[PDB]
Amino acid sequence: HITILTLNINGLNSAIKRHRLASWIKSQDPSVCCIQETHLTCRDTHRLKIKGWRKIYQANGKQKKAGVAILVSDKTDFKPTKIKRDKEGHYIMVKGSIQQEELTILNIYAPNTGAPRFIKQVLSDLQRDLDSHTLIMGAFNTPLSTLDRSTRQKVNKDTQELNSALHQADLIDIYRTLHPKSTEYTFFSAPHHTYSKIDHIVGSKALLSKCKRTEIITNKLSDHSAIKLELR
DNA sequence: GCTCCTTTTTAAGGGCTA
DNA sequence: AGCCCTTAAAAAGGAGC
C-alpha cells in the first residue's frame, strides 16, 4: 500500500511556510500529496521543492490566487501517461501507474462562489479521461451531505446536482462511505464559530474494495485540516 | 538585511429584493 | 432560492528601521 494526502495549504508564497510544508510532508510520508490554494503564479512553480518528492505537477494562474499541485513520492515509481492542466490554476489531472496498478488523480480547487457547479462542469470537461480508477480531491468549498456541516442545514439543490453527476459517473465520497455517521470537520469559520467539511476525497466506486482508512489530520500549517487515505 | 503596520483575501451566515 | 455585505484572522503587501 500507497498513501494519498489532501491539504488546502492556504498560501505558499512565504518561504518559511514552504519549509514547514516540506517538513510536514516528510513527516506524514504519503505516496501522493495533493495541495490546493498554493497561490503560486505560472512563473513561480520552481519555488515549490520538497526533498523526497521530486515529481511535482502544478497548474497555476497568473495571480497569487488558486493554484494546485500533485506531489509524487520518490519512493514509488510513478510513470505518468497524461497531464491535463487548467491554466487558470484550478485543477490538474495526472494519470499513471503507481506500483504498476493504473490510477487517475484529479486535484480541484473550486471557488466558493458557485463551487458545486464549477465542479460539475469540470467533471464534464474532463469526462473522457475519467475512468474506473479515479480519485478526485481538493477544496470543493461545498459540503456534500448534511453531515458535512455543523449547522446541518439541508443540502443545496446544486449539490444534489453534483451528487447526481458523481453517481452517474459511478463515484462516491470515500470519507462518508467509510464513516457514514461521523461528524469530523476540515474547516472552522472564525467569524461564525461554525464547522464544515468542504474538502473531500471522491473516488471510483470500483476502488472502494482497496481502501482501508481515511483520517482527518490536524496541523499547524493551514486553517484547513488534511485528509489521509491508505489504499491497497 | 530587518521589524512593524496596512491592505487583501477568503468561507459563511444572516438579513433581504427580483 | 439566491444575492450582498459583513465578519475574523491569516496571507500578501509595503514603509520605514
Author numbering: 7 to 238
Quote the study on this structure:
The autonomous non-LTR retrotransposon long interspersed nuclear element-1 (LINE-1 or L1) is one the most abundant mobile elements in the human genome, comprising 17–20% of its content. ORF1p acts as a nucleic acid chaperone that binds L1 RNA, while ORF2p provides endonuclease (EN), reverse transcriptase (RT) and RNA-binding activities through three distinct functional domains. L1-EN initiates de novo L1 integration by producing a single-strand nick at a genomic site generally fitting the consensus target sequence 5′-TTTTT/AA-3′ (6,7,24,25).
Two mutations were introduced into L1-EN to facilitate crystallization of the enzyme complexed with DNA: D145A to prevent DNA cleavage and Y226K to alter crystal packing. The double mutant protein L1-EN-D145A/Y226K was readily crystallized in complex with two DNA substrates, dna14 and dna17, and structures were solved to a resolution of 2.8 Å. There is one DNA-protein complex in an asymmetric unit in crystals of L1-EN-D145A/Y226K with dna14 and two complexes in an asymmetric unit in crystals of the protein with dna17. The ends of the dna17 substrate interact with symmetry-related proteins, resulting in unwinding of boundary base pairs. Thus, the DNA helix is distorted at the boundaries of protein-bound dna17 but is stabilized in protein-bound dna14. Remarkably, the observed deviations in geometrical parameters were almost identical in all complexes of L1-EN with DNA for the middle part of the DNA substrates, particularly base pairs in positions –4 to + 4 relative to the scissile bond. These findings suggest that conformational changes around the cleavage site are stabilized solely by interactions of the DNA with L1-EN and are not affected by crystal packing.
